[PDB]
Amino acid sequence: DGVGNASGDWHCDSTWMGDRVVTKSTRTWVLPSYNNHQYREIKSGSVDGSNANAYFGYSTPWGYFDFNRFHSHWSPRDWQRLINNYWGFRPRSLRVKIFNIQVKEVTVQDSTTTIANNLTSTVQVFTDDDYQLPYVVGNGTEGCLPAFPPQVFTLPQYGYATLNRDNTENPTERSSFFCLEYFPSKMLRTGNNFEFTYNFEEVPFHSSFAPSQNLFKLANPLVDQYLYRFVSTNNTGGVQFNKNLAGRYANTYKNWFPGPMGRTQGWNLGSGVNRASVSAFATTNRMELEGASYQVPPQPNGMTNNLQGSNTYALENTMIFNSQPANPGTTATYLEGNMLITSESETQPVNRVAYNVGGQMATNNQSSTTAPATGTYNLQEIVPGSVWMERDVYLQGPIWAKIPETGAHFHPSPAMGGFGLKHPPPMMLIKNTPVPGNITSFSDVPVSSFITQYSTGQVTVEMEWELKKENSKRWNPEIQYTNNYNDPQFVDFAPDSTGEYRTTRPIGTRYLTRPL
Amino acid sequence: DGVGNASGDWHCDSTWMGDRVVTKSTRTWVLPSYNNHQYREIKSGSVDGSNANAYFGYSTPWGYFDFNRFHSHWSPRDWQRLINNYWGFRPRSLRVKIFNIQVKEVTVQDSTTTIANNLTSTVQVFTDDDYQLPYVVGNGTEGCLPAFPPQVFTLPQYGYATLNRDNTENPTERSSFFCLEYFPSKMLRTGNNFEFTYNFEEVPFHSSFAPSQNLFKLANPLVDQYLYRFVSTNNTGGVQFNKNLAGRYANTYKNWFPGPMGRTQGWNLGSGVNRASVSAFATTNRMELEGASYQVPPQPNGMTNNLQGSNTYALENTMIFNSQPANPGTTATYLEGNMLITSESETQPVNRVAYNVGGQMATNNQSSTTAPATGTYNLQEIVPGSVWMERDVYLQGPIWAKIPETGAHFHPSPAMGGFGLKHPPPMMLIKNTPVPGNITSFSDVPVSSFITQYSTGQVTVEMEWELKKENSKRWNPEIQYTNNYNDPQFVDFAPDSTGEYRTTRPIGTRYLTRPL
Amino acid sequence: VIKELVVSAGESVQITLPKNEVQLNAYVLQEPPKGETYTYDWQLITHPRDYSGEMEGKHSQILKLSKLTPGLYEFKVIVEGQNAHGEGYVNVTVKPE
């Protein structure tokens, strides 16, 4: 209620309750006064020789809350207890609560930066629950809540890129500008707090199970099919047929088919017999959209890199995390030992691999003169009767994404993994209100001299997850995420002597196994 | 409720109410920001030539409250009124209450350390009442509430040592990491307080009485036993018997037996005829546990140093306190005049002495050729029909300890004395919330620059003690703890001209006397 | 900013009863100028349990010390100058008869 009273407590826990788990998480944040309290016009042309990077947009002084990663809510033990016990999970509700606001004021006088707090300065928070702003949350950007609870994170500055003109930095007449002070926002002093509740829409469970059985090997290898296959022609043009035998899965009749494919390049990790000195930009899979051509990693769902125990990965198809957060705007050439190169090997009985051709189809009509000929294709889209698996979600990866408000779409599983939401959690924007400096006269030009200041405080996020319980009559034990290190020099998913949070490997969800 | 109102009063008293005494005690504490708000990896190898000292563990920024000593609750007069009037005591309830929180902020600018308080900064307190953390309280460590109420103490930093690997500093795959911000903690401003109640489980009373009668001398010396003893054999092999006479306790039939024993070395205090220039490390009693060998003072219950009025003590068996608190990490060679070397002479009718052999047993089978031979043993464990006395508790010593969560145990009297608790008082952890400094840009790396700050405040602890009333038909007066000094140069258990709290001698509990 | 100096005088002294009356010097490195005045601060940090107390801080180079029960004595001396600040320790170990 006032300055000498706590406006909320530290809730950071998890409570497994049957087929349901709430996951609370309080973090501490810092909000810089971005742009010195003004809207700016960020724009760029073709950098790196590509006019795909040309954008037009606006950068606001508003910061925002991005709790759209799984480690922001899940400890690695509560993640381990999830992915080794349950076949699925999906979010149900959400409860965000910003509290203990305190706003300092830096006063650099003769290089003595005194930092004191003003009790009177406010903080604006609104939530965009009519979805009228550019939703920039679900795009794999930084500025998230940290994985580790005693880390203090700075809130990312809110910008958005509108329509540019002809792949330049210049706008078009459809390019918009959203003023964010034209939205009603709650003014928060140091004794006020901002609560917010949200209920997720009906989404499918994330299929956190690996297949126990190949897709083209769903018949039993004991009894044989009552269907025959064309095998050959005789010395005349008379066709000949053979019975599909029992375990001959290469030529049985299939009833279901794998998912989409676009053949990406496969690069060897580990030892590697890769091509030396490849500038890997000019040969990636691009998807040209209204002018320029864009790299689109990862490719849409229905494929996999990395078959099984092979060091060949499709690096265009994968999600490559770093081990630690990096400095912004770095041009460092990281190697294999720095990254978390993340495999989708668990879905190979259903999905086709991305560094191999998917099949072959007949190219000509045969005759007594022309022999039959086939040709391999590098990409195949949705066929009726297809079945694929969605992208695996990770502890270090995004939870949701917003479906773009277009006319139509085909089934909206995000390519980066997670939950495709039509009405996602609304984007909580926040800024410091501008406090003017010493203004002694009237002028019609607006104030450009402000008290330089930042605010800080805590935020708690309480999600709730409906879980799909495992129910299998499998006899032998399964593979599960065990803590298996040979001679650990450090405890993983735990700090070090420096005090930085050390993660080494990404953690999937498909560890339970389930027959098709 | 707010900054200008006291959030609790100074309760520090004791209220004897029949067979019950409540003992309140308020102290003032200081909490430094330990580790600069981060988890670290403390580890060590073999120091002092011993790989027993090799540990792996983690050090938290959390401090904790350790009121697990008897002088934290008891004045020496209320301790004197206890140990001279009652045969037993045990804790019943507990009530801890942290209040009057105020958090300063040190700002060293040009070597002028200005210390001002911020009204907005918080303090996290949780209590670990599901016992999920490593309980480090009952282990004889420093950082307790002081004996003397106007002393201000600093809260000890919370660390714990997990499993290392092969007696090195490296971890094993079973070594855990407990994040303490993954526990729900109450955020406390300067107008908030933290209350906590606790009820102790059913424990036995501490037997605060000395025996009035020897264990092997429980018969009367007037009438003689109806049981005979084998005394000798004649010139043939014919056995001969004699009646056990009345007061001949060296050869009567015994019904109860003394406790465990492990023979320790006995060293002479006072004048001393000790062996000169002994490096006393290589000849102590060790107990090798999973690799390395550990000194284990004091040895388990059932023995005593110091028979009666002799200057020979078993220094491996005793509890050696200092007179004053010492600086941390000191390598000073203290002498007899500095220490509080604490005798267990009061329990010698029941317990065996630790610098003598406990008995002798037959080593061979006799014959007409071989004579009978016996051999002294240096250690004897639990025999059915044993009876020993527990370790005496002291005014300067620990109250409780936690039984380790293993499978099984034998009757859990702690070797350091006190009350073996299965569910001990939960460990009240506390830290300062991190307030970030001047952060002007977004970076994905967590904040490492903080406002350097400490907090201070008061804590009151209200225990409640059920007492066993003395009821004896002894005629003559007893020995009691009297204030007996010959020419005092200072009042003991009271300050001096410097103002430091002067204690000279440890105070037991066994002063009442009671027949077996 | 205050600079440093060196305190070195022992650190064992190892006196023995009955001859308990000892005094401790305050050797300073390096060589001070004749204008710089030093202030000293002798503090008793450990002493035996039967110690009476006649050592109170002389703030001088000479530390008188009387009525010593046998045990370990530790003195934290604090040497403070105009732009110089050092400190030292001394273990006086009094043995009985």
TrEMBL record, chains A, B:
Residues 1-487 form the Coat protein VP1/VP2 Parvovirus domain. It comes from the Viruses. The keyword Cell membrane does not apply. Keywords: Capsid protein, T=1 icosahedral capsid protein, Virion. GO terms for cellular component: T=1 icosahedral viral capsid. It is found in: Virion. GO terms for molecular function: structural molecule activity. Belongs to the parvoviridae capsid protein family. This is Capsid protein. It comes from adeno-associated virus 5. The chain holds residues 209 to 724 of 724 of the full protein.
